[PDB]
């Protein structure tokens, strides 16, 4: 019997608003450690890794390890019936194929209770190869978001070039081309370059990743030659949300 109490319920809201457009149906792994979710996107071009540690919850409790095949769209809709201030409570029954969302409004004169139908998902599981990264860029999530929106008007893909001094994003299309340059501080931008890197990514997906912006003031980007870019947003004391995007390769001949 699962039961978690989250006082800053807006966090849950923000999480679903960050997964719903990228993932239709996902699986929520519950355990004494906390909730966790890992899923490729529809396109199978990226992987989302959500981590909500039980510590972050104001009351966690997991008797039986659960695997809830959830329709993120239904859960999102349901979650919009919560005030950004209500206390949200996830509660399930190891025997029931339904999850329960209870929202308690601060002043407790109102309580919403939603029972969402779960589903059997035979989701294709993947395993991330723990690796090292040539470059790690920390920067305001808002700036990152803006960058991705801007370039989106120029072209479909963005070339992320990371050197010693700073990092550079650039694109090109019908209406010419452009690029944005960020340099380390001396709101700040920190860069850890062991090796200059250059990779091409689709702005379409980066733009999906950015729906997580309201989850953190900052975001870190981790790249490396010929490997998936890592876009990660921390969820203060709760855990995090990581997005892996496969790069675009140059088909030679």
């Amino acid at each position: 019997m699962f039961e978690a109490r989250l006082v800053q319920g807006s966090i849950l809201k923000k999480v679903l608003e960050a997964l719903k457009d990228l993932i239709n149906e996902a699986c929520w792994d519950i355990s004494s450690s906390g909730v966790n979710l890992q899923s490729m996107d529809s396109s199978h071009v990226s992987l989302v890794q959500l981590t909500l540690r039980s510590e972050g919850f104001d009351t966690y409790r997991c008797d039986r390890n659960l695997a809830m095949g959830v329709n993120l769209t239904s859960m999102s809709k349901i979650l919009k019936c919560a005030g950004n201030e209500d206390i949200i409570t996830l509660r399930a029954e190891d025997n029931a194929d339904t999850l329960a969302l209870v929202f308690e409004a601060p002043n407790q004169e109102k309580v919403s209770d939603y029972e969402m139908k779960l589903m059997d998902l035979d989701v294709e599981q993947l395993g991330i190869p723990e690796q090292e990264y040539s470059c790690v860029v920390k920067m305001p999530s808002g700036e990152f978001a803006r960058i991705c929106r801007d370039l989106s008007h120029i072209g479909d893909a963005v070339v992320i070039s990371c050197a010693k001094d700073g990092v550079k994003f650039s694109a090109s299309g019908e209406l010419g081309n452009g690029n944005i340059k960020l340099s380390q501080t001396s709101e700040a931008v920190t860069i850890e370059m062991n090796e200059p890197v250059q990779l091409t990514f689709a702005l379409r997906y980066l733009n999906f990743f950015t729906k997580a912006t309201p989850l953190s003031s900052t975001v870190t980007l981790s790249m490396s030659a010929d490997v998936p870019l890592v876009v990660e947003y921390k969820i203060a004391d709760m855990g995090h949300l990581k997005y892996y995007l496969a790069p675009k390769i140059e088909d030679e001949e």
């Binding site: 990226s46 993947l126 395993g127 091409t200 995007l245 675009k248």
Partner: peptide, 13 residues
Amino acid sequence: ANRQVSITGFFQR
């Protein structure tokens, strides 16, 4: 930078 690759080509199932 041309063709989009799927994460499967980097992550095994």
